Design a protein around this ligand. Structure first.
Ligand SMILES: Cc1cc2nc3c(=O)[nH]c(=O)nc-3n(C[C@H](O)[C@H](O)[C@H](O)COP(=O)(O)OP(=O)(O)OC[C@H]3O[C@@H](n4cnc5c(N)ncnc54)[C@H](O)[C@@H]3O)c2cc1C
Ligand SMILES: Cc1cc2nc3c(=O)[nH]c(=O)nc-3n(C[C@H](O)[C@H](O)[C@H](O)COP(=O)(O)OP(=O)(O)OC[C@H]3O[C@@H](n4cnc5c(N)ncnc54)[C@H](O)[C@@H]3O)c2cc1C
Lengths: 391, 391
């Protein structure tokens, strides 16, 4: 079989790039290891930047978002008995963030592709990439026991952190930057009305807590746990008690608990690879980088890689300007690094680290005191949160 | 579930280490991505060193080998109309090589384990390794849709070149050495009596050719092909014509052709990672390194990693001397590098490289002339072929 752009992975990056490309007339096939069911089961992201909201409109998959998505004009940080709100709207010059689940964005894109008639192969086993540096690269996979070959011009690895793409580039060609945090995030999705109309990030001596939502009747809560924790050691009862314990009394007493729909632990890490391409292979999304969930930048950074990749591929096909693909990595990394720095900053100020000395604890407290108390301090959190401008 | 040593991969390395360990009283589980059928379908290796022959006896799986295996006392190299034999026996001090297929060695080990009652999980999907640097690491997998957890003390990645193990070690911790040759090997297995009682490696202007065997009525032939070749572009007819064309007339006219049982193309490469371990994770076999098939050192290097790993684990469990595991990589790499140098040497003297100048072509010819003409020259090929001593 022959396509123009072979896309590995059908999570938001692949689906979004597939839809952007198909709409512009560039044929593409998407190969996915799993079933549509498993992809749709991943809870993940809740906060979207206006950059992605616009790219979804541009890809024509925004009807449902514009109806169900909640537009948030502020966030709240809690520490040392105080609850400080950051007015994103005022401090960033009118930009905001939209809360709409990744499971939804992924569902909408899946349906759109399903209707478009563009090719998608779920349960595509043992994907191997070939002749990446050639003029004609190919992808091979197994469907029902028979090994097929797919020919294409370019390949886009949108296969997440554990994908085959990044592994297909010679090690000596990539330089890895990584940091693994000594903790994880225990999340819990409940069919209960959220404790606030805005998100409440919270620093507390027992550890970090986050009050988020999916809609007016669906919530998503998180608490920091050691990497040694097993999710089956955390009953619903225990999660509510622990969450309540880390939030301000006024917030803790308005909390409406309930059984969990989903409950899982996600480890925190920062990871960046340089460069993000190799021959006819361009990495996008988690395949190329991971950011701690603290700053809500993962899905949003994928959106920008995918926007930059699509626009360059348009020039390549539509205008024959294929030499611009060489700049993919350069453009992307400038944005990736700044979002990596924020996610790192946020993580370090909101979390309790093991074996922190008196001086560090104090500096962590003063950071929040300064930033949340200064107009210029607040403006730096706001512009970074709403999302730094796309290049 | 809880085991002592969790082994990822059930190719020869895993099976051999599982059997060596089980026999010494150390419990082990083997997780395999594929079906026993697929593993048994891989044709691969034909030549075994006396080191592995002995380790198989030590693991008690040699009845069939000692009956079906062919003990070879010499090999033959052909170039510039000459056919020079290397007497391995005389030149190495009495050592020899045994020809017995990998499919057989793998079959024998599979049956032995099957009888022993030791645990084996075929079709073990999405294996992820965890807490490698902890005191208690674990492996998670999916069997029939349900994700299980396996606890263990140590883990041995015997999952080949495309395994999850090597990918589980932080990139910044590993230094990769790699070389990809501009050609591959087109093999063809036929149920025909071999053209000679010994192997004939051959340098010819059209490219490399190798005359090998599995038994007196089963043969395995190879010819060098560009990486651009598709196996479906090579009919049986075409392979025989091409093989005949690269061999000495006297050898070419005694050839008994026939239809192919198996026919596939394998790309050539050299690959070494340093170090070969990380915390409670030790790499063995192809997971840690690849050698061009030219020198018949791949399976044999795996045998030595597995022998060194087992012996160190005996001291660790049996004698409580767990500090010796720190030397695993040091010991292994000394052997790996020398076998890598030979496989590289062999490859460079027997193959036709694209864009080779007059001087290089001549030096390639003189290398064969010198080595095959000098007593000291021949002795260097012989001692390396039969296998350099285990440390
Ligand atoms: C708890 C949590 C909260 C988060 N919150 C936010 C938030 O509020 N806002 C935000 O911006 N970010 C957030 N993030 C990040 C975001 O979820 C990810 O960056 C995003 O899902 C990555 O998109 P992706 O499409 O690149 O990869 P993925 O989502 O990883 O999907 C990749 C696909 O590749 C497929 N695949 C893998 N290997 C293969 C193979 N070999 N063959 C074929 N296909 C293969 C997989 O099965 C998977 O379907 C959060 C993350 C977590 C864990
Ligand atoms: C054409 C050819 C000829 C050769 N000839 C010779 C010869 O004559 N003599 C010699 O010494 N060498 C030779 N070699 C080399 C030899 O075949 C290999 O070195 C050897 O097979 C490697 O053994 P292994 O057990 O480490 O890995 P493998 O043989 O690669 O088996 C590894 C197993 O790991 C499993 N696996 C992979 N990933 C996972 C996952 N994620 N979960 C679970 N399991 C997983 C795989 O499905 C596979 O079953 C030859 C190679 C080739 C290609």
């Amino acid at each position: 079989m022959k396509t123009q752009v072979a896309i590995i992975g059908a999570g938001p990056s692949g689906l979004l790039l597939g839809q952007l490309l198909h709409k512009a007339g560039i044929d593409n096939v998407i190969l996915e290891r799993r079933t549509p069911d498993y992809v749709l089961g991943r809870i993940r992201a809740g906060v979207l930047e206006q950059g992605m909201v616009d790219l979804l409109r541009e890809a024509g998959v925004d009807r449902r978002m514009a109806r169900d998505g909640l537009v948030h004009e502020g966030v709240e940080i809690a520490f040392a008995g105080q609850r400080r709100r950051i007015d994103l709207k005022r401090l960033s010059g009118g930009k905001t963030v939209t809360v709409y689940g990744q499971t939804e964005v992924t569902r909408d894109l899946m349906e759109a592709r399903e209707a478009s008639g563009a090719t998608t192969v779920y349960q595509a086993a043992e994907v191997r990439l070939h002749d990446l540096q050639g003029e004609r690269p190919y992808v091979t996979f197994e469907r029902d026991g028979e090994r097929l070959r797919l020919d294409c011009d370019y390949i886009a690895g949108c296969d997440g952190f554990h994908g085959i793409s990044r592994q297909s580039i010679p090690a000596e060609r990539l330089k890895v930057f990584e940091r693994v945090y000594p903790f994880g995030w225990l999340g819990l999705l409940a069919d209960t009305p959220p404790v606030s109309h805005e998100l409440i990030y919270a620093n507390h001596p027992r550890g970090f807590a986050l009050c988020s939502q999916r809609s007016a009747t669906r919530s998503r809560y998180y608490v920091q746990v050691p990497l040694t924790e097993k999710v089956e050691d955390w009953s619903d009862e225990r999660f509510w008690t622990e969450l309540k314990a880390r939030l301000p009394a006024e917030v803790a007493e308005k909390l409406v608990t309930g059984p969990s729909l989903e409950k899982s632990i996600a480890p925190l890490r920062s990871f960046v690879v340089e460069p993000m391409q190799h021959g006819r292979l361009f990495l996008a999304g988690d395949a190329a980088h991971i950011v701690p969930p603290t700053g809500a930048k993962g899905l949003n950074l994928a959106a920008s890689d995918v926007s930059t990749l699509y626009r360059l591929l348009l020039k390549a096909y539509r205008e024959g300007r294929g030499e611009l693909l060489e700049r993919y990595s350069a453009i992307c990394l400038r944005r990736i690094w700044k979002a990596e720095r924020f996610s790192w900053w946020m993580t370090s100020v909101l979390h309790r680290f093991p074996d922190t000395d008196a001086f560090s604890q104090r500096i962590q407290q003063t950071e929040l005191e300064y930033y949340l108390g200064s107009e210029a301090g607040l403006a730096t959190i706001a512009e970074n949160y709403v999302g730094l401008p796309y290049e």
